Symmetry: C7
Subunit: 237 residues, 7 copies
C-alpha cells in the first residue's frame, strides 16, 4: 500500500457509469422509478418537535401485523422511514445505525444529525459513478432532534440531500406534498400537526378511500422518540 | 486458516446490476421463476409452537427415501425449508447454520431468530447489486421458537423477508396460501393444525390427486424440534 | 427481445451468471450436454457393500490398456467414477482426494462420506454463480462404506447431489437407469449384484452388441475396496 | 476485513476511456452538459479582496431556506461555489476540505491556494482516463486570499483550471460572463463590486425577471471570509 | 402468454469460458487447430526403453541448423517434444523443467513420470476455465523411463492426458498413427524400432517425397538419454 | 467458416489495446489528433544555449494574463512546453518535476536530461498497452542544458522521443517546422536566433495576421534559465 | 462499429486472447504488420565475430543525427537492433539491459547470451495470452559473442526465437534475406562480410537508389564491440 489510498477498491467494475448525451445518468433515473412504486410516507416539523407518519397498507390476515415496521429507529433520538426496494432500504438503514454509533463512540455524542444523513448519502453517491455495481433503489427521510434542534432531511437514490420544514416520499409524494405545500401550518402543536399530516396523507393515497392503519411516531425536544400505539393513531384515524 | 487467494479474476464482465426503464431488476425476477418451479411447502404458527410441512414428491424406487430431507435443522430449536435451485438452497442453508453458531459463541445464546434470517437475507441482497455474480435462485422459510416465542419467516431471492402467522412457498404457493388465507384458524392445537395444513397442502398441489408422503416436523415452546416419523405422518395422510 | 438497450457500445460481451427469463442457467445446461456424451457407468448398493462398474470402451491397440482407469479411489474405503470432460473430472477428483485427507488429519477420521461429496459439490456450485469462469462439465458418483454404512451418491455440473439405492451416469444413463428401475433387487448378494449390473450395463449401451471389457470394483462393510482382475470381470462378461 | 489484502495492479475496469476519431473525450463532453443545467454563480476580484455570489433559486416553502447553502467554506480564508450534479459537487468539496487541512498540518500553513485547486483538479483528471468509472459531473470555482493575495480559479469536469479576474459558471455563464467581459471594472470597491456582480447576475438568468434571493460572500486581504446576511443582500437586490 | 425467447439455443459470448449449446469449448477447439498446423513427431515404446522422433523440416541455409531442437530434455531421464504455437510450447516446456526439479528437491527423486505430466497438464487445464486468458495452443508428448519402467504420454490443449504403446503428434498425426496402428510391433528392438518409426513418419508427411533430416533420441532402462548424431540418423534415413 | 472478419470501417470503439489489421494503434492516433488542435510552440539550439518560444494566444480581458504560462520549468536548468489536452499536460509535467528531483536526490545531480525525458516518455508508453486506460493526449518538448551540453527533445502521446537541432509542436507544426527546415542557421547567436524563431512562428500560425504576445525563454550553458519580460519579447515582436 | 476485412461474423481478436477458427492469434498477426512497416536491418556471423547493420534513413536537417541510434548495446559484448513500434522497442531494450545485469550480478557472468534473449522473449510471449494487454509491436535481433562463441538471434512479437548464420528484419526483410540466402559466404572475413552485407542491404531497400548513411557495428571474439565511425562506413558506402 505504497500509495496509501483513503478508500479501498475491490475492483474497477463494468457498467453503470455512462452520461447520456444530454447529461443524465439513466440508471439513477430508473432507480428513482422503483422508489415511486413504494409506499407513501411523510414527516413534518411542528411546535417543538418533528413527527413521522407512514401508510401501513397491509394485505393478508397471515401477516404478522406490527412486524412490518416502516418507521425505524437509528437511535433514541433519530428515526428514519424509507421507500423503494425493501432489501436495499434495510441494508441502508443498518449502515446508518452503525454509522450513528461510530460518531457516538468517537466524539462521545451525535451532535449534528445532518452529518449522519450526509454519510449514508455519500455511500449511495459512490454507486452513482463507481462502475460495476447497481445503485441503491431507495429513498428515505431522517427525522429527530439534535444539538441544533428538530431536523428533517430526505435523501434520494442519487445521494442528493435537503432539509425540509415538511415533506413526503414514496408513491403519493407529488400529491401529499402539494397538500402541505398549501395547508402546512408553521408551528403547529403536535395534536394538530398529526391531524394535518394524516389528513394530508389521506387526501393523497386515498384515491382508494380507506386510509387503513397509518404508522406514526413523534419526538419533541428534550426527550426520546415516541411511537404511537394502535389505539392512539386510530383516534386520529 | 485461509484460502490464500493471492490474486484472481473471479468476478468480472458486465450483464447484470441494471435497473429496467420501469424500475425492476429483471435478473432477480428470472430468479423468482426458478423458485416457482420448486416443490411446495408451508408452515404455520399454532397453539404454542409452529410446524413445517413439505411435499416430498418422489420418483424412482432407486432413490434413498428419507435422505432427500427437505426440512433441515439449523439448530435444535430452529429449522427451515427451502424451494428453488437445490444447490443454491443447500449452500445458503449451511451459511445460516454457521451463522447461527456464530451468534451462539459470541453472545452465548441465539436470542432473536429474526436476526438469523436477516443475516442470511443480507447475504442474498448483496448479490442483488454487486455486479459480476448471479443471484441465489431460491426462497426459503425459517421456523422455530426463540426468546420472543414461536416465529415464522420467509425469504425470497431478492433478500426480502417477512414474518407470518402461516404461509407457503414453492410451486403451489398461490393455491395453498389462499386456502389458509381463508380457513386458517388462529390458535389451532397441534393435531388440528397439522391437519388443516396437510389439507391445505393437498388441495393446492393435489391437481394430481395423490398427496404421496409429506415431510412434517414441529416444535413447541419449552422444548426442541420433533420430526414426524413415517407412520405418524401417514396417520394424518 | 431486448429489455430496453439503446447504448450503441453495448450489444454483447455477456458473462456467465445470467438466469434466462424462464429461470434457467443455460450454461449449466450446456455443461450437462457434455456429460451426456461421456462414457457410461453405474453402481449399486447390495448385500453388505457397494460396487462400481463402468464401460471401458477402448479404441487403438496402442493405448496402454488399464492405464485408462475410469474407477478411481479417493481413499481405501471410498471411490468415484466420472463422466463428461476428462480434464475437469481429473482435477475435480484430485480435489476430493486432498479434501478427504483434510478431514482425516483434522478429525482423525472420515466418519461421514456424505460430507466429502458435499464439499466437492460446493466447489462445483461456486462456478455456477461466480461470474468470470466456466462450469465443471462433469458428473461423477462416489460410493463406498462409511461409519453409517454402504453409501452411494451422484453429482452433476450444477452441484446437485443425492443418495441412491442404485444409479448410473454418462451416455447410457436413461437406459441403464430404467433397467434397474425395474429389475433392481434390494439385498442382492455380490455375485448376483454384479450380474444384474453387467446385464443392465449391457442392455443400455449395447445397441452396438459388444460389451467390450468393463471395469468393475466393489467394497463390502468391514474392509477395503477390491478391484476386479481382467479374468474375474471376464467371468461375468 | 479479517483477512489481509495486498494492493497491486493499478489497472482495473473497462468502459470510459475512448478518444473519438477527432480526438475528443465524449464522456467528459457529456459531463459538461450536466454542469450547464446547474444553477448560475460567479465571482470577481475587487479592490482588496474577492467576492462570490450564487443564484439561490428556491421552490417550495417547505425547503429549509439557508440550509441549501451553495457557497461553501473550505477554510476561513478560502471558499468555493459549485454547479452540476449536486452529489458529485459535495463529495468533491469535502475532498477539497480534508486536502486543505492536510497541507496545513504538514507545512503549517496553506501558502498558495493555487495548489489546493490543483489537487482537486487532479482528482477529477484521474476519472478522465482510469478506465471503469464515471467522471465527476461538476464545475466549481475557488476564491479566497492566500500568501500571494486575493485569488480566483475555476475548474471544469475535464480537470482544467484557470485564474480569472472575474468569471462565472453554471447555467447563465455565457450571458453573465459577457456582461462582465464588457463592463467589468478593474479595482472596483466592494460595494460597487457586488453591485456590478448582482446586476451581471440579474441580466443573465433574468430572462425570468425575478432575481429571487442571491447568496453572496466576500473576503478582503488581512481577514476572514464574510457571508452577507439576508437583509444586507436584500439591500443590493 | 408465455416467454420463449430462448428455446434451447443461446448466443456465444466472446469471453473465453462459454460452453456451446452442444457442450463444447470452442476456444479449446480452435486451439487444437493450431497444433495440427505444427510439425509432425512421434514416439513408441520398444525393447527396453522408448524413443522419440520428429521431422526437423528446415528452410533457409541461413538457419543455425541443430539450434532448432524440437526434442528437448526435461531431465537426463525424461524428454518431451512439442507441436503447435512455438512460444506456447517453450514456456510450457520450462515449467515442466522446473516442476521436475521441485519434485526432485522435496522427495529426493522423480519416482513416477506420470505425475510430472499430470502437473504440466493441470496447468493447461486451468486456462480452460479461468476466464480472461487464452488457452495454450500446443500439444506435447513426454517420454522416458521412471521407477515403473519406460513410459510415454501425450497431452493436448485441453489438458487431456493418456499413455501409449506408441503415438504421434502434429500435422501428419492421423497418417502416421494409422501406420503404427497397423504395423506396430510390440517388443521391437531399438534398431528396428527406429526403422519402423522412420518409415511410419516417412509415409505420413512424405506426400512431399523428401523426409529431410529427422531429429531422433532414445533412452533405455538403466541409463540416461541418447540423442542420435547427424550421421547415425542419416544411416536409417 | 474461416478467417472471419467484421466490417473494415471503424467507428464504435471499446477496449484500448487492439492493433488494427494494418499494424496501427487507432487510439494513440486519435490521441495525436487532440494535440494537433493545441497551441503552436517551438524550440531551437543556438550559439551556446537553447531557447523555447510559444504563441500565447489570449481571449477575454478577464483572464489573468501571465498566469496562463505555457513554458514551464522542471528545474532551473530544464524547462518544457506542452500541447494537447491541458489537463493531461499538467499532470504529466508534474510527473517530470518529481521525476527530476528523484534523480537529484539519489545521484546528487541530474547529469543527463535525455534520461529525464525517457522516464516521462515510458510513463506514456505504458498507457499505450496496459488495457483499461486512455493514453495521454499530449506532446511536449524538453530543452535545457545538461552535463553533455544544450539539449532539445520532443515527445508524443505514443511515447516516441527524438532529439532535435530545432523543432516545433502544436497546431502549425508542419508550417513552422518547414520554415526552419529551410532557413535554420546552425550556430545562430541568441538575439538572431530568437528572431529567426519568432519569424518562423509568425509565418506558420500567422494566417491570422496578428502574432499577439509570444511567450519566450532561453538558457545558456553555464547558468540558469531566463524568461523574457513582456517588453523584451515585445522588442522582437 | 468494428474493424475487419469484411468476410464473416465473429471478431478477429478485439477482446484479445482469442484463437481464430483456423488457429491463429489475429492480434499477434496485426502486430507483425507494424514491424514490416519499420526500418530495415540485418546481421551475419563472419570470420571470428559478428556484425550488425541497419539502414539509418534520415529526413530533416533539424534531426540530431547520431542521436537516432538504431543499433543499441545491452552490454559491451552484446548488442541488438530493433524494428517496429519505436516506443515498444525502447522499453523492450531496457528490459533486456537490466535483465542482463541481473544474470551478471547473480552468477558473476553472462555465460550464455541465448538465455538473455529467451527472457526477453518470454516477457513478450506473456502478452500473447494474458488477456487485457496489447502485445509488443516489435521485433529485434541480438548479436554478440558469449561463452559458446559468436551468436545471432532474432525475435518477433509472438515471442518466437531462432539462431542464425545471418538474417535481417524490418521492411525489406524478404528482399535482403534472399540476397544472403544466395550470396552469403560462410567464413567471410569482416571487411568482405560488411561488404556482402552493405551490398545486400543496398539491393533490398534500394528500390529508392540512395542507400543514405548506414549504421554499422561489429565485435570479434576476444574483445568488446566496435561501432564504425561516419567515415569508416562511408568508406564501404
Amino acid at each position: 500500500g505504497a500509495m496509501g489510498m483513503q478508500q479501498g477498491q475491490m475492483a474497477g467494475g463494468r457498467a453503470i457509469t455512462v452520461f447520456s448525451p444530454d447529461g443524465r445518468l439513466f440508471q439513477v433515473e430508473y432507480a428513482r422509478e422503483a422508489v415511486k412504486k413504494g409506499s407513501t410516507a411523510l414527516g413534518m416539523k411542528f411546535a417543538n418537535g418533528v413527527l413521522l407518519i407512514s401508510d401501513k397498507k397491509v394485505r393478508s390476515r397471515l401477516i404478522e401485523q406490527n412486524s412490518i415496521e416502516k418507521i425505524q429507529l437509528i437511535d433514541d433520538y433519530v428515526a428514519a422511514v424509507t421507500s423503494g426496494l425493501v432489501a436495499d432500504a434495510r441494508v441502508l438503514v443498518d449502515f446508518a445505525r452503525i454509522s450513528a454509533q461510530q460518531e457516538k463512540v468517537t466524539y462521545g455524542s451525535l451532535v449534528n444529525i445532518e452529518n449522519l444523513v450526509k454519510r449514508v448519502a455519500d455511500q449511495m453517491q459512490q454507486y452513482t459513478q463507481y462502475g460495476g455495481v447497481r445503485p441503491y433503489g431507495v429513498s428515505l427521510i431522517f427525522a429527530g432532534i439534535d444539538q441544533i434542534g428538530p431536523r428533517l432531511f430526505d435523501c434520494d437514490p442519487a445521494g442528493t440531500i435537503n432539509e425540509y420544514k415538511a415533506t413526503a416520499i414514496g408513491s403519493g409524494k407529488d400529491a401529499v406534498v402539494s397538500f402541505l405545500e398549501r395547508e402546512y401550518k408553521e408551528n403547529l402543536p403536535e395534536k394538530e400537526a398529526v391531524t394535518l399530516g394524516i389528513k394530508a396523507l389521506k387526501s393523497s393515497l386515498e384515491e382508494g378511500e380507506e386510509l387503513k392503519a397509518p404508522e406514526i411516531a413523534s419526538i419533541t425536544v428534550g426527550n426520546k422518540y415516541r411511537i404511537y400505539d394502535q389505539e392512539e393513531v386510530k383516534k386520529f384515524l
